[PDB]
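Researcher: We plan to redesign the surface later, but first we want a full-length starting point. Tokens attached.
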């Protein structure tokens, strides 16, 4: 699909850099006609067919397609898309309160309530996505943003649809591989992938939220991946001694090697605790 080829600078003014990735840079911007602010994600295009620099048009179009489908309080949303010879520029809903990653770094250790307040919103967003048969495939604290970091219980939006795929046959097979710390065993082992991989990532995020420690993280990427595939984690008493047994139960039912045996997003919302890049 073609996108708007007018100069985005004719319509927006850019400001502070919000973040970046390997082939993307995200800048705060303001739309001239409305004064409204957005996050403009500039994705570098591939210069040739065989090139390894840049993102393939197929991959850019998938992210755009998926983003166009979604409207939910806990997901990022797409306003407009522009392109030029070098970039596709997604004008995204601005999430101005920083990454959950940065909040967790700056904050003292979370209470179980603080953890479940973030987690319930993540679960609601993922419920929405999975209802649409969208697997996010890159859930992790840097891909969660807070609307406003200065309130007691910050509201969040899931961002970064760069690895997201529609799962219309129950599984996909094109290996998608995110960050070792957060990927499920089926990703590590290059097996067919579905919505279950997100549920594993939620288990890892939950472990981190409650403890400030990462369940599988080793000193090298290969060590982490080996730990993930073997389900080599435990609940360290030093971090978890005042954490409830129900919270541990929730995590234990997500960090399951067999994706068929792992809790689904619906299971996770009914669970008694809740119910009211890979290479060195
Ligand atoms: N809508 C948004 N509002 C505010 N900040 C954003 C938004 N989208 C992205 N960012 C920031 O920009 C960073 C990179 O954008 P992202 O969509 O994650 O592209 P990426 O390069 O595919 N992911 P990564 O490689 O993990 O950084 C994020 O980690 C955020 O810090
Ligand atoms: Mg990202």
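Model: Full-length starting sequence:
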């Amino acid at each position: 699909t073609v996108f708007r080829q007018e100069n985005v600078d004719d319509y927006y003014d850019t400001g502070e850099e919000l973040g970046s990735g390997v082939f993307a840079v995200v800048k705060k911007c303001r739309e001239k006609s409305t004064g409204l602010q957005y996050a403009a994600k500039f994705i570098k295009k591939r210069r040739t067919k065989s090139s390894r620099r840049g993102v393939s048009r197929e991959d850019i179009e998938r992210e755009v397609s998926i983003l166009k489908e979604i409207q939910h309080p806990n997901v990022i949303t797409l306003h407009e898309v522009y392109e030029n010879k070098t970039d596709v520029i997604l004008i995204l809903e601005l999430v101005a309160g920083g990454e959950l990653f940065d909040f967790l770094a700056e904050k003292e250790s979370l209470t179980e309530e603080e953890a479940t307040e973030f987690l319930k919103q993540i679960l609601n967003g993922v419920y929405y996505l999975h209802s649409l048969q969208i697997a996010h495939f890159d859930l992790k604290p840097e891909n969660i943003m807070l609307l406003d970091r200065n309130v007691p219980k910050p509201r969040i939006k899931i961002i970064d649809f760069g690895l997201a795929h529609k799962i219309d046959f129950g599984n996909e097979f094109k290996n998608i591989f995110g960050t070792p710390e957060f990927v499920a065993p089926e990703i590590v082992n290059y097996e067919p992938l579905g919505l279950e991989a997100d549920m594993w990532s939620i288990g890892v995020i939950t472990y981190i939220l409650l403890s400030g420690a990462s369940p599988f993280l080793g000193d090298t990427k290969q060590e982490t991946l080996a730990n993930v595939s073997a389900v080599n984690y435990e609940f360290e008493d030093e971090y978890f001694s005042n954490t409830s047994a129900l919270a541990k139960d929730f995590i234990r039912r997500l960090l399951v090697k067999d994706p068929k045996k792992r809790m689904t997003i619906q299971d996770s919302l009914q669970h008694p605790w809740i119910k009211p890049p890979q290479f060195e």
